[PDB]
Amino acid sequence: GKITLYEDRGFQGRHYECSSDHPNLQPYLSRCNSARVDSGCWMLYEQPNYSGLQYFLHRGDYADHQQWMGLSDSVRSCRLIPHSGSHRIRLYEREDYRGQMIEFTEDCSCLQDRFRFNEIHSLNVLEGSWVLYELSNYRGRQYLLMPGDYRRYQDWGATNARVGSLRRVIDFS
Template sequence: MSEQQGAPEQLAAGKSQGGAGATYKVVLYEFENFRGKKIELSAECKDVGEKNLEKVGSIVVESGPWVAFERQGFAGEQFVLEKGEYPRWSTWTNSQNSYSLLSLRPLRVDSAEHKLQLFENGGFAGRKMEIVDDDVPSLWAHGFQDRVASVKALNGTWVGYMYPGYRGRQYVFERGDYKHWNDWGATAPQVQSVRRVRDMQWHKRGWHQLKESGKPPSPPSISGTSKPWTLSEGH
C-alpha cells in the first residue's frame, strides 16, 4: 500500500491483459479526481478498510475487469469496473442508492464469445430470450418485458441493469445458472437492459472507453438463429 497526492500515472499502452492467467490491477483513491490516499490491488479485497482506506472517491482500472460491492465481503449493490478512469462516483454507477464501495474482486471472462438466456419465470420457465454476442439497451423495446426471474449465462460474463439504457442497479452474470433473481443479488425480478463485460484479452480498451466512441450498435432482429438474439414462448 502507498499514500500519494496527485493524479495517477499514465496507463501503459498496448499491454495485453485478461483471459486465463491474466494479471489484474486497480488503483483506489480516497477522494475524487484521483487525489488523497491510494491503494493498489491485484487480487480480491474483502474490505478496503483493512487496507487503511476509509472511503473510495475515484478509481483507475489498469487491467480488468473487476466487480466492486457496496459492503464488505462482496455484498450489497454491485459495480462493474472495466479498463479506464473513474474520477467520481457517478462514473461507475447511476443508481444513487449508496455512496459506499467497500470490497471488490476480479471478474473472469471464459471466452471471447458471449451467450445469455433470460427467462420470464424462475427455474428457467416461461418466455425465453437468447442473446448471442450482442448488447441490448432495452429488452422491452424488442419484445421482452422487464420481468427476468432466472438466467443462464452460457458463455462470457454479462451485466444486467434494472432500467433501459444500462441504468440503475447492476447485476453480474458470470458463467453459470441462476434459478432465482436472489441468486444474482436482486430483490425483484426486474432487468431491462444487458451488455457483455469486456475482457482485456479480446477488448483492449474495455467498455468504459468503448461506450464513449459514439459508434451506433447494429439493430438486433428477432427472427432466425443466426441473428444476435431470439425470442421464444414458454411451454
C-alpha cells in the same frame, strides 16, 4: 487485471491497488471517490464479501464515484471479473427456466424491444460474464452475472425481477 482505488476525487489521497478479488477493503481504504482501471473489468461492492450495491468498472479513468453511478463513496470489496473470449446467456420469463426464453450473445440496451416482459425470473449464463441492469441503457441497479445457473432473481442479488438492459463484460483493450 489492475485497479487503483482512491479515497479522494481526482485520483488523490490514500489509495490501494488490487490485482485480484478483495473481500474486505475496509482496513486499506476508508472510502472511495475515484478509481483508475489499468486493465481488466471490475465489480465494486458497497459492502464486504461482495454484497450490497454493485458497480461495473472497465479500463479507464473514473475521477468521481458518480462516473460509475456510485450512490456514495462506500466501496468495501471488489471482484476481478474473469475474462471470457465469448458470451452467451439465456433469459427466462419465469423461475426455474420456465416460460419464454430469449438468448443473447451481444449487448442489449433495451430488453423490452426484444421481449415483451418487464421482468426476467431466471437465467442461464452459458459463456462469459455479464452485467444485468434494472433499467434500459445500462442504468439503475447492477447485477454481475458469471457462468452458472440462476433459478431465481435473488440468485443475482436482486430484490425483484425488473430488468432493462444487459451488457457483456469485455475489456476493449
